[PDB]
C-alpha cells in the first residue's frame, strides 16, 4: 500500500500548476523517493492524486487508453473537461459497488487558451476553481493560494511559482510523510509540461530552536 | 434461384441476393433529401401523418426510407449511445463515431441465421465540433458521407437535380439552402405543403430541430 501524499494546483493568467513530491510511503517508511506521480493524459492534460499509488495506477491506465483510441479510431482529442467528466463517473460507479477508488484526484489542463484546475474524492464529489489541493494540501496549502488569489486581476506564472513555493516549504515541514523534492507541471499554451524535480529552501536556525531555550529541564 | 432465401449464402457471383432485396425495401418508401453548406444540414422528407425525421440527441437527428419498425429500432439505438457518451462526457456524441456504430449494426443482421437485415436507410445530420455531417446508412450496412444526396421512391430525379447545384452549395445561406433540399425533393413527384412536407435543420448555434407548420410556411 505505496501511497502518495498532498498534490496541489493553482490558476494563473494564462494557465496552470500542479505540483507534487516524488515519494510513495508505505505507512511511515518512505519507501521511493524518485516516483514521477504526475500523469499526461492525452494532448491537454495531467492528473495526480493523493491516497493509494496502485488505485491511481488502474484509473489513470483505464482512461489514457480511452483517450488514446478515441483519438486513433476517428473520434478526435479528449479535452480536460471530457476527461475530468469520465473519471468522476468511474470514482462515482465503483464507490457504488462499494469497490472505491481509494484517492483523491487533482487533474489540470488547458484547451482553447481556458485553463481548468479541479477535484474528485473518493465518492465522487466533485468541483473546479482556482486552486485545488489534496492530502494535506487542503489544510496546508489552500490558504495561502487563496490568500495570494485575492489580489484583483489574478496572479502571473511567476507570483504563482513563488506561492506554489511557499506551500511547498510548509509541507515539508508539517506533513510527516514527504520529502524536499518536488515536480510542477505547467498547463500552458494548450499543452502540458512536466518540469525536473527540484527543492526548496528551509530555516531551521532560528534562535528559539537553540539547545538551551528548547531544553525542558534547565 | 436457389441462392437467395438466406443471408448467409453466397451465391458462385460472390452476391449476398438477401442484402440486395432488404436494400429495395428502402428504394420503395418515400423519398427523402439531404444537403449541406458550411454550417448547417438540411433533412427534407415527404410524407406519404407518417413519422419520418426522428431527433436523436441535441445535434443530429435523421430521416427514414423503408419498413418504419426497423427506423424506430435504428433510433432508440442511437438515442441510447448519444445519451450515454454525454453522460459519461459531458460533451456532444462526435458524428464519425455515431455512423460507425450504426454501421457495424447493420453489418451483424446480415451475417447470421438468427438474425434480418434491416429494411431502412438513413439519412443522419448532425453538427459537432468539426462542423455539419450527412451520411447515408443502407442495409448491406454501408455508410457514405454526402455533401447531398436522396434515398426512396423515384429519388433518382431528386438526385439529378442536386447534381448540378450541390456545387454551389457552400457559399449557400440557410434560407437558399432549404429550397435546394425543395427543389429536389419536389423532382421527387401532388405538390408540396405544409401538411405533407417535413423540413428539419441542425448546425451552428442550431440544436436538431423539425420546422412547425408555421416557419415553414415561409418556405412553402
Known amino acids: ?218 | 434461384n436457389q441462392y437467395d432465401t438466406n443471408t448467409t449464402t453466397w451465391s458462385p457471383t460472390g452476391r449476398l441476393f438477401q442484402v440486395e432485396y432488404a436494400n429495395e425495401a428502402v428504394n420503395n418508401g418515400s423519398a427523402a433529401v439531404g444537403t449541406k453548406n458550411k454550417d448547417f444540414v438540411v433533412l427534407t422528407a415527404l410524407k406519404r401523418y407518417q413519422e419520418k425525421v426522428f431527433k436523436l440527441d441535441d445535434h443530429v437527428g435523421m430521416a427514414i426510407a423503408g419498413l418504419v419498425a426497423d427506423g424506430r429500432m435504428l433510433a432508440r439505438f442511437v438515442r441510447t449511445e448519444c445519451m450515454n457518451y454525454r453522460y459519461m462526457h459531458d460533451s456532444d456524441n462526435p458524428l464519425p463515431l455515431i455512423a460507425e456504430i450504426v454501421g457495424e449494426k447493420y453489418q451483424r443482421h446480415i451475417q447470421f441465421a438468427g438474425k434480418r437485415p434491416f429494411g431502412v436507410g438513413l439519412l443522419i445530420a448532425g453538427y459537432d465540433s468539426t462542423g455539419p455531417h450527412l451520411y447515408h446508412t443502407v442495409p448491406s450496412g454501408d455508410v457514405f458521407d454526402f455533401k447531398a444526396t436522396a434515398m426512396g421512391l423515384r429519388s433518382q430525379a431528386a438526385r439529378t437535380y442536386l447534381e448540378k447545384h450541390f456545387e454551389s452549395f457552400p457559399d449557400c445561406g440557410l434560407d437558399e439552402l432549404i429550397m435546394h433540399a425543395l427543389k429536389a425533393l419536389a423532382a421527387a413527384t401532388a405538390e408540396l405543403n405544409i401538411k405533407n412536407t417535413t423540413i428539419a435543420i441542425v448546425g451552428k448555434g442550431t440544436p436538431f430541430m423539425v420546422l412547425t407548420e408555421e416557419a415553414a410556411r415561409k418556405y412553402l
Open chain 1, 1 to 218: 500500500m505505496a501511497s502518495g501524499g498532498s498534490v496541489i494546483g493553482v490558476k494563473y493568467n494564462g494557465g496552470v500548476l500542479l505540483a507534487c513530491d516524488t515519494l510513495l510511503s508505505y505507512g511511515s517508511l518512505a519507501k521511493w523517493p524518485n516516483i514521477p506521480r504526475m500523469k499526461l493524459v492525452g494532448a491537454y492534460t495531467v492528473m495526480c492524486a493523493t491516497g493509494d499509488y496502485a488505485d491511481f495506477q488502474e484509473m489513470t491506465t483505464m482512461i489514457e487508453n480511452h483517450v488514446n483510441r478515441q483519438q486513433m479510431y476517428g473520434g478526435g482529442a479528449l479535452t480536460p473537461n471530457e476527461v475530468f467528466c469520465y473519471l468522476q463517473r468511474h470514482v462515482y460507479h465503483k464507490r457504488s459497488q462499494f469497490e472505491p477508488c481509494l484517492c483523491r484526484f487533482v487533474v489540470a489542463g488547458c484547451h482553447g487558451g481556458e485553463p481548468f484546475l479541479g477535484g474528485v474524492d473518493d465518492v465522487g464529489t466533485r468541483w473546479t476553481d482556482d486552486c485545488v489541493a489534496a492530502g494535506y494540501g487542503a489544510y496546508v496549502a489552500l490558504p495561502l493560494l487563496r490568500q495570494a488569489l485575492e489580489k484583483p486581476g489574478g496572479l502571473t506564472r511567476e507570483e504563482a511559482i513563488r506561492v506554489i513555493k511557499d506551500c511547498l516549504r510548509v509541507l515539508f515541514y508539517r506533513e510527516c510523510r514527504a520529502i524536499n523534492k518536488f515536480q510542477i507541471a505547467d498547463a500552458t499554451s494548450d499543452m502540458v509540461s512536466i518540469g525536473e524535480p527540484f527543492e526548496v529552501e528551509t530555516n531551521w536556525e532560528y534562535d528559539g530552536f537553540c539547545f538551551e531555550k528548547t531544553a525542558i529541564i534547565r
